[PDB]
C-alpha cells in the first residue's frame, strides 16, 4: 500500500514448515511471493536485520496464526505439544558483534 505502515502494524510473519522445509512469509494477511526451500536437517534461527531510524525499532512477537504451531513448541522439546505461545528465559535476543 505504501507509506501507511506507521498507522499500525507492519507485522511481517515468518512461516516455517519443518516437515516440508518450505519457508513462507506473510505480510498484513497476504502471502508474499518470496519463498525458500531449505535442505533437510537445516537449523534456522529467527533473525531480523534493521538499520534503526527511530528510538523504537521492531519487536519480536511469538504469537500463532490460524492452524500454525507457535515458535516455542518448535524451539523447546518439552513444549512440543503445548499450543500456548511461550517465551522461556532461555530464549533471548542476540546481536552480531
Amino acid at each position: 500500500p505504501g507509506q501507511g505502515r506507521n498507522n499500525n502494524g507492519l507485522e511481517i510473519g515468518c512461516v516455517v514448515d519443518a516437515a516440508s522445509g518450505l519457508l513462507t512469509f506473510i505480510a498484513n494477511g497476504k502471502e508474499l511471493s518470496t519463498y525458500y526451500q531449505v535442505e533437510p536437517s537445516t537449523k534456522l534461527f529467527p533473525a531480523v536485520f534493521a538499520q534503526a531510524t527511530s528510538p523504537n525499532v521492531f519487536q519480536f512477537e511469538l504469537g500463532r496464526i490460524k492452524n500454525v504451531m507457535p515458535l516455542s513448541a518448535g524451539l523447546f522439546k518439552s513444549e512440543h505439544k503445548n499450543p500456548v505461545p511461550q517465551c522461556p528465559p532461555r530464549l533471548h535476543v542476540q546481536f552480531l558483534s
Binding site: 507509506q3 498507522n7 531510524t53
Partner: protein, 176 residues
Amino acid sequence: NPQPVDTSNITIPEKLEYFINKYAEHSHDKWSMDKLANGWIYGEIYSDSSKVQPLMKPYKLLSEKEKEIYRWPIKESLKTMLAWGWRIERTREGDSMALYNGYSPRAIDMSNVTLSRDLHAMAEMMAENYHNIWAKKKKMELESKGGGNHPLLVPYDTLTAKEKAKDREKAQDILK
C-alpha cells in the same frame, strides 16, 4: 528589530498544491486528536462550551473557508521557505506515493521519524525567522498598547529552550 523574510513578491507553485492539501489534512487530523483528547464530540451545531464541533468530519467535508484557516499558515510558511530558494524536489518515491493515492483519528506519529544534521540546521533557522514573524506581530500590538518590553521579545538566540520548543516542533513537524 524583527526582520521577517518577505515572501509576498514570490508566488506559490502548482507543484506544492497537493502537499498543501495533504498537510492541511494532517493538521486537521491533529486538531481532531487534540479535541478528542480534550473530550470533544462531533455535532451538527458548533458550541464551544458543550465540547461539540462539526469539524471532526474530514477536512474534505470541511467547507473551503474552514479549510483556508489551516491552508494560509501552511502556504505562508512554505513561501517563506521558498524565498531562500530551498530546492524542494518531489523524488520518485514522492510522485510514487502520489500515484498510490467523527472519523477514527488517524495521523502519522511524527516523533519517531527523525530529520538529519543538515535538516536540523534548516529547522533551527526556520524557527529563527519564524519567531521573527511572531515578534513582528508582537511588536506591532506592542505599539498598540504604547510601550514596554515583552518578556519574550528578546531575540531568538536570547530565548531559552522552552519558548523555542514550540517553534522547533512546528518547523520539524513541517520538515518531517
